[PDB]
Design a protein around this ligand. Structure first.
Ligand SMILES: Nc1ncnc2c1ncn2[C@@H]1O[C@H](COP(=O)(O)OP(=O)(O)OP(O)(O)=S)[C@@H](O)[C@H]1O
Ligand SMILES: Nc1ncnc2c1ncn2[C@@H]1O[C@H](COP(=O)(O)OP(=O)(O)OP(O)(O)=S)[C@@H](O)[C@H]1O
Ligand SMILES: [Mg+2]
Ligand SMILES: [Mg+2]
Lengths: 318, 643
DNA sequence: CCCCCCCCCCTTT
DNA sequence: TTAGGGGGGGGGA
DNA sequence: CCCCCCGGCCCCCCCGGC
DNA sequence: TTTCGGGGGGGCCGGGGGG
């Protein structure tokens, strides 16, 4: 078959600010800005798949209307964004003459701005300062720390928070109603649990489950979406007896095809984020895990090394 | 009516969930918070104190009206409290103080002075607002007159930073000394030129042809530079990071403008209007060791025939080394809250949203003295919340907190603090936070930790563990971290091991000796020692290959075995036979193809009781002069023939 | 007016 | 809890 | 026959975890 | 400091085209 079905992430991508779930206060602020205009330079930061690009595009559309094509300059990591681009194309766009209503400005949308080089960011400073009367800049990024301090000083900070399970369930229910998808409460709970606050991941998993099995229930959802291995690693590290930890390692991780490097890196991360355990114990476990990680990187990526790491961790915990 | 002193006397005194008091009840009280409160955290207690308009000093002095002593109070704080004889109270003491001082006035002269200062600030804000509205009315009248008998931009469409940008020098808040110094330097630039920049005046600014303004972001450097340039009637030629400023462009660009008349100045005819003021803004924004043009700009600074003002954010960066002692350095410090409270009140009332003056300082703390950021925060928040006060100050401050990467000294100070390694402190500043603190400057963090991990009084020692044992454990972990680092920078480039290197090199050893810095934090001394070792090894290699044809050993063997005998046969004769042993020394030098530089380097290698600096100095100058003359008055052989 | 308070900023390749 | 020491600047007996 | 535009090496400078 | 590898930015050099 040479035909494609449009992904539901694109088909049901919000087109207005009112269709975005989560971060209610920021969405209301953006709605007020759209109503009144005078949009300032802004930096929107947050975790993947929470509606940052969607928010920026919706704000630009509501602000500009018919003028969107002329008054919006969009650049992302897939386009050329070197110092020359900033110095020529962005400057030309900023200096461009464009008659707009008495409360609107041209918009430059720099998506994934955290990937831009230091030189381009430095060149953007006086460009933003001088042409603010007619042009405004909207950065979208995952890590606001990558944006240099002078640019942060020039922009309004908007830190997006993770989506609660309630909002994900609400959006999934809207999509299900619009698509007439047969489902069960347990299946939706499994999808939400596996998504971990990633709306895009949740929608993709729902669409894949519907396509592959039809009915959205726990069995089909877990068949399509594998249980995250970090939870398995956490269970392995928290086991009371060495035999149980070895059992988990051999059955749920090693026999499923997970590589030793992945297992050791996930163990390091989980141990780092193990608040239930005393910090000094966590540091000793990290020392052992690092020894094992160095051994694996050298080339000895065997099940015996991971078993020895588990044995040392249990000896420390005892 | 009631004076705060009588309320304090009523409150129980100490010797060595809260009632809603009336507004500004604690006005005029300097409350210093120390220890740990039962119900309120340090931040919560400070916020509560500020809610009532109480100054919260970070230290204890003679003006400390009251002290809030909690559990685990700093020993220095108690020492100074007893030395200065300052009263302290408990949680219930503070509760009664807030609920026992409702008059919010009528106390000693301090409260009246505070009220008068508040009224003065309000009056200044109102006067500034009146001036702004008068300017707006004048502009509207002129616009209407022109329209009656080109599209302009209405003020409502402008950013608040542009709308409220200072119009003259006085409107610049903070850094008055720096602004005055810059104005004086530029005003007398012609006089300095007449004197060829040779004579130095009272301020010493007459010997510099260029000025360098440096400070943190959003403090008014560009604004001040432009205002001073305009006030003195100069023509401004401005360059920034948006323009190409490489060495070639610099030579073919502003270089010709150093000693060139301005055509605009001639066609706009002040006596200085025909001369340029070259403003190089964002000087730290150019990248490149040599092609960037930083060195070229430094050379330009030494012969410019017109005033040259450079602006940068980081003055101590290596890229800025060429500007060491060629320009007059002017520091712009972070402005304090008071200098800008009037401006913030003026903006708040003009924009028709309520701002509590008692929270302004907190906003500054959020922006770290960034005025532009403060104005942006007000503009963005006011769009939906028209009242700013203690109700939502915490959320606003937390949302807009400026996460600035710490400097190596701050990283060392925080990582070695014992509080963050306690049971309570570890849950607030987690292990992930410490790893991120390392990643702030991974290059320098392990060096700083290794430098300063032996200069602390620990507070995390386990029962029965001495300071020496913990130090040894930390040293072992540091050695393991060094091994890991060697692994990272090998041909395999195992950069994925960087997080582990964070734990082994910084977090673990710091946790082993975490406590209070017993003395000043010192910068790592390893880099200078490494450079010295490299220099000495280069000298040793040169000496070894000069004497290779005669000796039988490697360079290490030459240093460890040959050099003492060479000293005995090269330095001792001068000290024993005086100037009669020059011939023997020269003969030995020729036999091994040694030169005078080789002689000095050899003498510079010895350590311990064989140091030769004092011995060399004590030698009569006549003997050294004769030795040099004899060496220069004859031909010597060459070991390595370069071609 | 010198003294003090209070804070910020430099140590640093 | 404030690492030590120097600079800036508002308040004042 | 000479000058100018513009593609391609050549070099040098800077991260490298999340 | 720095043991590969990638990315970016700037400087010449030279082929081709045009007058
Ligand atoms: N708040 C949301 N409400 C509704 N749909 C959302 C929301 N967030 C994400 N989605 C859905 O997931 C799709 C992708 O959303 P995006 O805006 O691209 O997320 P993102 O944070 O910009 O991703 P990154 O940071 O570039 S990985 C949208 O088209 C929506 O279909
Ligand atoms: N001392 C100040 N007083 C009043 N407003 C200020 C002050 N400093 C900054 N601002 C405000 O912030 C805006 C920008 O000020 P700037 O002069 O650009 O500061 P800056 O130090 O040059 O920032 P950088 O170095 O380019 S990041 C001004 O137009 C003012 O509106
Ligand atoms: Mg996106
Ligand atoms: Mg500036």
């Amino acid at each position: 078959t040479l035909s494609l079905q449009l992904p539901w992430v694109e088909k049901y991508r919000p087109q207005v600010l009112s269709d975005i779930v989560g971060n209610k206060e920021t969405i209301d602020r953006l709605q007020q800005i759209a109503k009144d205009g005078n949009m300032p330079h802004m930096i929107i930061s947050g975790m993947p798949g929470i509606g940052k690009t969607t928010s920026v595009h919706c704000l630009a559309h509501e602000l500009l209307g018919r003028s969107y094509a002329d008054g919006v300059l969009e650049l992302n990591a897939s386009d050329d964004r070197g110092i020359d681009v900033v110095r020529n194309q962005i400057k030309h766009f900023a200096q461009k003459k464009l008659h707009l209503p008495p409360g609107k400005h041209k918009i430059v949308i720099l998506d994934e701005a955290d990937s831009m080089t230091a030189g381009a960011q430095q060149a953007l400073r006086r460009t933003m300062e001088l042409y603010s009367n007619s042009t405004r800049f909207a950065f979208a990024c995952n890590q606001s720390n990558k944006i240099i301090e002078p640019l942060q000083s020039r922009c309004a900070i908007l830190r997006y928070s993770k989506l609660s399970d309630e909002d994900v369930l609400k959006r999934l229910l809207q999509i299900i109603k619009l698509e007439d998808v047969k489902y069960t409460n347990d299946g939706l709970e499994a999808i939400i649990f596996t998504a971990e606050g990633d709306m895009r991941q949740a929608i993709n998993n729902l669409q894949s489950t519907v396509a592959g099995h039809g009915l959205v229930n726990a069995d089909n959802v877990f068949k399509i979406v594998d249980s995250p291995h970090p939870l398995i690693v956490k269970k392995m590290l928290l086991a009371s007896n060495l035999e149980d930890s070895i059992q988990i390692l051999r059955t749920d991780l090693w026999k499923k095809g997970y590589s030793s490097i992945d297992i050791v890196t996930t163990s390091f991360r989980v141990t780092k984020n193990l608040a239930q355990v005393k910090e000094s114990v966590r540091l000793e476990m990290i020392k052992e895990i690092g020894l094992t990680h160095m051994r694996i990187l050298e080339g000895v990526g065997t099940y015996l090394q991971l078993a020895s790491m588990l044995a040392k961790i249990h000896k420390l915990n005892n | 009516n009631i004076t705060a002193q009588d309320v304090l006397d009523k409150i129980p005194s100490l010797d060595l969930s809260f009632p809603e008091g009336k507004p500004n009840c604690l006005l005029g009280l300097t409350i210093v918070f120390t220890g740990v409160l039962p119900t309120l955290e340090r931040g919560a207690s400070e916020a509560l104190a500020k809610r009532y308009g109480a100054r919260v000093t970070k230290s204890i002095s003679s003006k400390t009206s009251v002290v809030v002593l909690g559990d685990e109070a700093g020993p220095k704080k108690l020492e100074k409290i007893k030395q200065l004889k300052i009263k302290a109270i408990d949680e219930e003491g503070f509760k009664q103080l807030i609920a026992g001082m409702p008059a919010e006035g009528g106390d000693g002269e301090a409260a009246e002075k505070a009220r008068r200062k508040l009224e003065e600030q309000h009056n200044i804000a109102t006067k500034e607002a009146e001036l702004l509205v008068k300017k707006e009315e004048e502009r509207s009248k002129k616009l209407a007159a022109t329209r009656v008998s080109d599209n302009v931009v209405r003020e409502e469409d402008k950013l608040w930073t542009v709308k409220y940008a200072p119009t003259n020098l006085q409107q610049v808040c903070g850094n008055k000394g720096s602004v005055m110094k810059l104005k004086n330097w530029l005003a007398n630039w012609e006089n300095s030129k007449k004197n060829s920049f040779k004579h130095a005046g009272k301020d010493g600014s007459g010997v510099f042809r260029a000025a360098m303004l440096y400070g943190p972001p959003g403090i008014g450097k560009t604004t001040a530079a432009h205002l001073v340039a305009q006030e003195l009637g100069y023509d401004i030629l401005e360059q920034n990071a948006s323009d190409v400023r490489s060495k070639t462009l610099l030579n073919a660009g502003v270089k010709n403008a150093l000693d060139n008349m301005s055509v605009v100045g001639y066609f706009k005819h002040n006596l200085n209007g025909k001369h340029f003021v070259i403003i190089m803004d964002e000087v730290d924004g150019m990248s490149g060791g040599d092609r960037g043009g930083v060195g070229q700009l430094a050379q330009f600074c030494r012969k410019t025939s017109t005033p040259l003002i450079l602006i940068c954010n980081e003055r101590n960066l290596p890229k800025m080394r060429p500007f060491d002692r060629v320009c007059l350095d002017i520091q712009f410090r972070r402005p304090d809250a008071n200098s800008i409270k009037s401006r913030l009140m003026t903006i708040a009332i003009r924009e028709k949203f309520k701002l509590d003056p008692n929270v302004i300082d907190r906003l500054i703390q959020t922006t770290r003295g960034d005025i532009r950021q403060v104005i942006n925060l007000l503009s963005t928040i006011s769009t939906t919340t028209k009242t700013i006060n203690h109700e939502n100050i915490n959320e606003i401050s937390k949302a807009w907190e400026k996460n600035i990467a710490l400097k190596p000294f701050d990283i060392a100070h925080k990582m070695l603090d014992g509080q963050i390694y306690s049971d309570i402190g570890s849950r607030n500043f987690t292990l992930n936070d410490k790893i991120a603190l390392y990643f702030d400057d991974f290059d320098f963090t392990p060096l700083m930790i290794q430098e300063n991990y032996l200069s602390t009084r620990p507070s995390v020692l386990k029962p029965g563990q001495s300071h020496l044992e913990a130090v040894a454990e930390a040293a072992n972990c540091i050695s393991l971290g060094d091994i890991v680092e060697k692994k990272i920078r090998s041909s395999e480039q195992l950069w994925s091991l960087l997080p582990l290197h964070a734990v082994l090199s910084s977090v673990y050893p710091a946790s082993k000796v975490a406590g209070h810095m017993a003395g000043r934090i010192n910068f790592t001394a390893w880099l200078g020692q490494n450079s010295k070792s490299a220099k000495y090894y280069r000298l040793l290699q040169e000496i070894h290959y000069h004497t290779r044809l005669g000796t039988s050993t490697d360079k290490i063997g030459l240093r460890l075995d040959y050099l003492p005998t060479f000293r005995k046969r090269l330095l001792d004769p001068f000290l024993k036979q005086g100037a009669d042993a020059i011939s023997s020394v020269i003969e030995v030098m020729d036999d091994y193809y040694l030169t005078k530089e080789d002689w000095d380097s050899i003498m510079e290698f010895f350590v311990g009781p064989d140091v030769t600096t004092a011995i060399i100095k004590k030698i009569p100058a006549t003997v050294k002069s004769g030795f040099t003359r004899k060496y220069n008055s004859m031909t010597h052989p060459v070991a390595i023939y370069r071609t």
